[PDB]
Design a protein around this ligand. Sequence first.
Ligand SMILES: C=C1[C@H](O)CC(=C/C=C2\CCC[C@]3(C)[C@@H]([C@H](C)[C@H](CCCC)CCC(C)(C)O)CC[C@@H]23)C[C@H]1O
Lengths: 239, 11
Amino acid sequence: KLSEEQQHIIAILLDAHHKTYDPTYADFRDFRPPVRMSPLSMLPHLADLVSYSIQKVIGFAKMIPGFRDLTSDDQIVLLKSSAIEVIMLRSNQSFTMDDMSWDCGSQDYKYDVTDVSKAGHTLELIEPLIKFQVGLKKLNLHEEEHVLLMAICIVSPDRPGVQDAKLVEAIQDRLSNTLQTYIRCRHPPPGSHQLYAKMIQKLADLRSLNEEHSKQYRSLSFQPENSMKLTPLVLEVFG
Amino acid sequence: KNHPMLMNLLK
Ligand SMILES: C=C1[C@H](O)CC(=C/C=C2\CCC[C@]3(C)[C@@H]([C@H](C)[C@H](CCCC)CCC(C)(C)O)CC[C@@H]23)C[C@H]1O
């Protein structure tokens, strides 16, 4: 029941994701090495991982149909506001419900609650992030749904600082209609509505995690000792 | 503020 336009959107988003997400995690070898002894020994490594991820998210975004047709300032506000959410979302692909960690091809590049702690984040945030990862994994999303959800996340008309909310909504609506139809092609009612509703609740949760973080990254990076351990792109993006 | 690196990654 997917039209050609809908199929073309999915195809573009699959390519973009495949181009910007290397399931071998080979590039990780070029980050500052992880250290698990040392206040914030994991901060250099995870800062490099976050920074790299921001670059990749930007790459994915630029391929979202219509995104690059937005103004430069709208593209920036959208990316600054969504980066962390898309990172979290995209990270579900490495996440495993075995031990509740992100497994990027080895023990050295396998990240757990304590690793994240040693990057300067409290368990109080870290735990809701793990829970989110669990809930998302349980959806057993198809890659088609996964990339649509990332794209919906980025092109949200309700992000602070957006000027042409209507244009951003026009893109988002096409993506949401594509996702809904794809879901319908896989699942009759009411399973279809159930799954969609859960995907929407995941985007709400990400907003919440985003808000909560901003307050935390404000106190972490406020410290000059910490901010110095980050990267230029991370400073630019997270203000 | 200015975002020269994000701008550059977008073009
Ligand atoms: C290339 C990949 C993905 O982009 C990201 C990825 C794993 C994702 C991780 C594990 C380490 C900790 C990360 C980077 C989390 C990170 C440290 C943030 C804090 C940095 C925000 C800028 C979590 C924020 C909380 C919720 C703790 O406050 C979110 C995603 C997490 C590996 C791989 O799938």
